[PDB]
């Protein structure tokens, strides 16, 4: 064949730290379907947002948003343990069906995204060259996000511990911990990985008695 009907750009969803995770690659022939399992970003997360994206960039913010829906009712669990099955199906009419299903709760939500959605032909060529020009920056972004997500997890866990600790934790331990949480949050907004890891460190150093209490 000299002609093939294809989805012209990658389709996928936003995942923790502003990353696009691809479910269908660019140039895949239609009809097609694919599924992948995802989980929650934080302990006890009760809902997830499925932000559907078209584009070749690893930064979610630089891809074309197609729609979004939430899936609620995820039962309490440590982060990474729920199994949220995401399915993208493009039918022969170019209609995109996306669903998410929580295997423990049985709950499911879905959206339909019509065939004319997303980028037009001019924008598709633009998107491809932009991802090529930004290949190496996007590889560094993905590294930055791995570290930001670790930092985000520590911030969350430590804060839950502060709460649960109540008065068992001495007041000057709490003062130092709050300062170190703020400094870690500030660092998370930068693009320097070492800077983030250094604040995680400064936090852990003021956290030993709290680690003892929690334990």
């Amino acid at each position: 064949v000299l002609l093939l009907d294809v989805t012209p750009l990658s389709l996928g969803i936003e995942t923790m730290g502003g990353v696009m995770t691809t479910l269908i690659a660019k140039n895949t022939t239609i009809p097609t379907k694919h599924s992948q399992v995802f989980s929650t970003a934080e302990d006890n997360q009760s809902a997830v947002t499925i932000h559907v994206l078209q584009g070749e960039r690893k930064r979610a913010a630089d891809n074309k948003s197609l729609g979004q829906f939430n899936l609620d009712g995820i039962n309490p669990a440590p982060r990474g343990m729920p199994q949220i099955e995401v399915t993208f199906d493009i039918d022969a009419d170019g209609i995109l069906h996306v669903s998410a299903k929580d295997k423990n709760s049985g709950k499911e939500q879905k959206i339909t995204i019509k065939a004319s959605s997303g980028l037009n032909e001019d924008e598709i060529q633009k998107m491809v060259r932009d991802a090529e020009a930004n290949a190496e920056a996007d590889r560094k972004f993905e590294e930055l996000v791995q570290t930001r997500n670790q930092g985000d997890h520590l911030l969350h866990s430590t804060r839950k511990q502060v709460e649960e600790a109540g008065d068992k934790l001495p007041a000057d331990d709490k003062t130092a911990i709050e300062s170190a949480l703020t400094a870690l949050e500030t660092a998370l907004k930068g693009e320097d990985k070492a800077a983030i890891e250094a604040k995680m460190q400064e936090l852990a150093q003021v956290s030993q008695k709290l680690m003892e209490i929690a334990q």
């Binding site: 923790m16 995802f38 934080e42 199994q83």
Partner: peptide
């Protein structure tokens, strides 16, 4: 598995 954000 990659992780998903909660609703804002």
């Amino acid at each position: 598995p990659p992780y998903l954000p909660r609703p804002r």
